[PDB]
Scaffold this active site. Structure first.
Site: not given
Ligand SMILES: CN1CCN(C2=Nc3cc(F)ccc3Nc3ccc(F)cc32)CC1
Lengths: 264, 278
Positions: B27, B30-31, B33, B48, B133
């Site tokens: 989807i 960092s990394g 998901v 994640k 966000d």
């Protein structure tokens, strides 16, 4: 959102020895750079149509670009003191790229040290054609305020009808970066910089007396507020300042110094 | 490098996550998901996966000890090879974006979403976390109407997209606090009644200038909003940070009292699923 972006794609077997770079990978009988992630279509289209030695070569998409191992001009301008002979060599190369693009009715709209890639042999190449404008006799000017605030011409900032000489202004700011190590108002916020370009006009150098009279004149022609008075790339290639340009080999000690300084 | 590895071993759960979860679907990167399902309970989860290192130890411990119904909570963690997997809650009703772009929400439905988001913001702010966000894309909906907030993930460089949700103090690069999330919520409410966030047809740099100068743009049709909704937006989108409401103050706003139960959101989920099927 459309798929006529899939129509320009070529269509793991063609390249080998992938090695991750930046925040972009390196691969191979030529060495290539592969960037893996509506404006992306314009960038691929303009790069296919506008091939010149002073522009980073777009090779293919499935984006495969040529590899320039000497980093960007930013690393050089922030880590070294360039002499006039070196600055003149960089300006000559960039103007050759601009003369080519402008004759093809293309406005880069994003000329800055970050978009100048250097080769280990001293070669100078222009990149990042995302923001470019393809003009025509039916629409010879643009109005959109696009670019990087610190490098933007006052006519772009104020959203007036502009042409290819916006790239000449940006080159003038880039030559200031080559002297001072930074574009004017870099310590300010990007919006405060936009206000300052729109109100002050031509930026003033911290120490103008350090420069030769011929370099001062070259900058004045680049950073002229009156667009008709500001030089075209073709006119500025005949400027006396570029005649003091050292060979491109003179840039390789600069690449060595930036690589030594940026070991973190 | 070594101290972070030893500290992780004492906090991560033992067992093979590849045996514990199924139906992995990317989807975002960092990394990375993935969406997945717990094989034993049927629960829908977000995983994640990742290869600064001291900051992640504390972020897990914060998530693990602090739980809220209006955020996707931490469920488990595993050390898989040289990767750390963090298992969080997830919901099957999609994002708020699908709802706002495919349906016409009424004020009672908007109020219900705003109340839930403010409850999530009150919680995060008390834990000294600024989301940064808050946007419809980060609001997850449950099939029972439940609303959950998610996240997951330079002046010289270029920005991809218009940062429409950003507060004027963020844009002008000033020091900023948790009330930036309140502004973003105000923009999200505009998206809920107009079907789009402001500055859509605007260039990202022209958007930045507009946010910095005028704050928020004029609504396309202001006569379509009730006076109590316009007041709620004015408190959210106030340029003076001290005058702008906190999450705790806005939870006492009169607008939220016209909120319909969360069951009123399930016909919206049904309509967005029908619109985005094929
Ligand atoms: C410094 N660092 C910032 C991000 N943090 C959180 N971020 C979140 C943000 C969300 F929108 C949903 C869930 C979470 N998980 C959280 C759960 C509890 C909590 F107290 C904070 C968070 C962890 C601490």
């Amino acid at each position: 959102i459309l798929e006529k972006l899939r129509s320009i794609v070529s269509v793991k077997k063609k390249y080998t020895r992938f090695e991750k770079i930046g925040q972009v990978y390196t691969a191979m009988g030529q060495e290539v750079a592969i960037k893996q992630m509506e404006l992306i279509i314009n960038e691929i289209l303009v790069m296919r149509e506008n091939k010149n030695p002073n522009i980073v070569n777009y090779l293919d998409s499935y984006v495969v670009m040529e590899y320039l191992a000497g980093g960007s001009l930013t690393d050089v301008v922030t880590e070294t003191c360039m002499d006039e002979g070196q600055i003149a060599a960089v300006c000559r190369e960039c103007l050759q790229a601009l003369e080519f693009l402008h004759s093809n009715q293309v406005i880069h709209r994003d000329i800055k040290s970050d978009n100048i890639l250097l080769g280990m042999d001293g070669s100078v190449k222009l990149t990042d054609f995302g923001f470019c404008a393809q003009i025509t006799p039916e629409q010879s000017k643009r109005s959109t305020m696009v670019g990087t605030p610190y490098w933007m011409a006052p006519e772009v900032v104020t959203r007036k009808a502009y042409g290819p000489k916006v790239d000449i202004w940006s080159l003038g700011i880039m030559a200031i970066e080559m002297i001072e190590g930074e574009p004017p108002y870099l310590n300010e916020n990007p919006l405060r910089a936009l206000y300052l370009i729109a109100t002050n006009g031509t930026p003033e150098l911290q120490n103008p007396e350090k420069l030769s009279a011929i370099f001062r004149d070259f900058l004045n022609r680049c950073l002229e507020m009156d667009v008709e008075k500001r030089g075209s790339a073709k006119e500025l290639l005949q400027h006396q300042f570029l005649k003091i340009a050292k060979p491109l080999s003179s840039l390789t000690p600069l690449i060595a110094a930036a690589k030594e300084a940026t070991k973190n």
